[PDB]
């Protein structure tokens, strides 16, 4: 797997409860099936002296989400997005498009309902067998 090389940028996912629907940013540290990653945004300590490292499943990893027609495109009610929240990307569904150009996003998993600015949203992508979508 080309992207899984030590030093490579990856988005990390969890099967763990409370982390349903999130991609956090990170890099590979070692590959042996499980491998070791270092989060970019999470730390062991509240003081940020020690980047969080974990052993996860390759199933759980993926390349950095693909990157100007893409970002200028409008967001619609019903579009699947990731919202940047708690320092990672969480998938929810756009429930409302607001007058000031903000958006209300429903998170099916946590029953949360949160408003965001466009700069806080990216289009949701899926990574399937080496391909995006």
């Amino acid at each position: 797997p080309s992207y899984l090389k030590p030093g490579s940028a990856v988005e990390i996912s969890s099967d763990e409860i409370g982390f349903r629907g999130s991609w956090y940013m990170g890099k590979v540290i070692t590959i042996p099936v499980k491998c070791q990653v270092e989060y970019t945004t999470l730390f062991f300590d509240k003081e940020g002296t020690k980047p969080l490292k974990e052993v996860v499943d390759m199933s759980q990893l993926r390349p950095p989400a693909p990157p100007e027609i893409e970002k200028k495109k409008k967001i619609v009610v019903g579009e699947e997005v990731d919202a940047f929240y708690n320092d990672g990307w969480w998938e929810g569904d756009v429930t409302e498009v607001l007058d000031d150009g903000k958006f209300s996003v429903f998170f099916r998993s946590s029953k949360e309902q949160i408003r965001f600015r466009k700069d806080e949203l990216r289009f949701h992508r899926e990574w399937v067998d080496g391909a995006w979508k």
């Binding site: 409860i17 409370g18 982390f19 349903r20 945004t41 999470l42 730390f43 062991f44 300590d45 509240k46 003081e47 940020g48 969080l52 708690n86 320092d87 990672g88 969480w90 998993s109 946590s110 949360e112």
Partner: peptide, 10 residues
């Protein structure tokens, strides 16, 4: 300064 404890939703 985000931690797993203050990042988890559950």
């Amino acid at each position: 300064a985000r931690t797993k404890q203050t990042a988890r939703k559950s």
